[PDB]
Design a protein around this ligand. Structure first.
Ligand SMILES: [Ca+2]
Lengths: 188, 191
């Protein structure tokens, strides 16, 4: 039961949906973050629950649902990490694990070229802003993948090359951008 | 940040002491074990504490001093690992880390004789010391007449009744938490 991978957007909010199977009576629930604890929760049927925030900082931007799912708002980079819900029953203490990732939304996708004759050879590079190591590019023509990197170099002959355009697609877990360029324009 | 290495003996107990306040005041304490939480403690300076244990695995085995120091009794191998105390002040949550290693007592020490079969009065002995199960952590040393003659299992001596006196070669095995000692006599081994 390895960690559920969830993606938060920098600046915005996110919920880690604490769930079951259960069956036995929950006595407590603890929300853990990395080495540390975030929140202690004594659930109650009749009453509101007693909630104890054990981690000052994060805690400012921290709330809980009717079901004790973690709600984290105005997400920061230092928010990334392993979150875990420990449902302390009377004979067991099972863990739900999440991996929270925080990424800026991709913006400003751009394409530049670097160079006649009858046969045209283009050197294309796709760039983006607010990238990370976990961005990923690919160049596509007619639904075919010419390249899986920001760099594409291809030959284009107006009179036998079947495609007429090249399209860069840049995406991460929360962004999907694309720019396309015209051989017939990039080759004079 | 350290953490503080602690040696528990299998089947015995061990506490883990806390350090505060040095200034701030604690609203709660959380004792953590590896991936999980063990206990939430809500102290009352003015009264008694509210101790919600969050991991029942540790049965009657888990306990807390008047000082909210964690104490585990009848330790098992499964207790090995990291314990952290999260002391929640208003403005932060500092951790006292511990790493608890569970060692077993040494049982059954043995000396074995790898000498030559027939002894020629000018007697030469190759002995070697053992413990029931060898661990990287076990340390041997031999002693005779107040002199330490080795710092490993093996011992080579020589002995001649005509000039050397009667004495016992004594192995001593030990690890962090315990020790044993067996002692053969030269007169016996050499005949
Ligand atoms: Ca709420």
């Amino acid at each position: 039961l390895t960690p559920l991978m969830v993606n938060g957007i920098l600046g915005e909010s996110v919920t880690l949906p604490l769930e079951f199977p259960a069956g036995e009576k929950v006595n407590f629930i603890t929300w853990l973050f990395n080495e540390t604890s975030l929140a202690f929760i004594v659930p109650h049927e009749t009453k509101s629950p007693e909630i104890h925030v054990t981690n000052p900082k994060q805690g400012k931007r921290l709330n809980f649902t009717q079901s004790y799912s973690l709600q984290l708002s105005n997400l920061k980079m230092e928010d990334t990490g392993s979150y875990r819900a420990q449902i302390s029953t009377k004979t067991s203490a099972k863990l739900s694990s999440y991996t929270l990732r925080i990424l800026r939304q991709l913006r400003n996708i751009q394409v530049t070229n670097h160079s006649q004759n009858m046969t045209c050879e283009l050197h294309l590079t796709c760039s983006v802003e607010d990238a990370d190591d976990n961005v990923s590019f690919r160049w596509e023509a007619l639904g075919n993948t010419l390249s899986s990197q920001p760099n594409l170099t291809v030959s284009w002959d107006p009179r036998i090359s079947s495609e007429q355009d090249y399209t860069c697609i840049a995406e991460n877990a929360v962004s999907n951008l694309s720019f396309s360029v015209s051989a017939q324009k990039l080759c004079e």
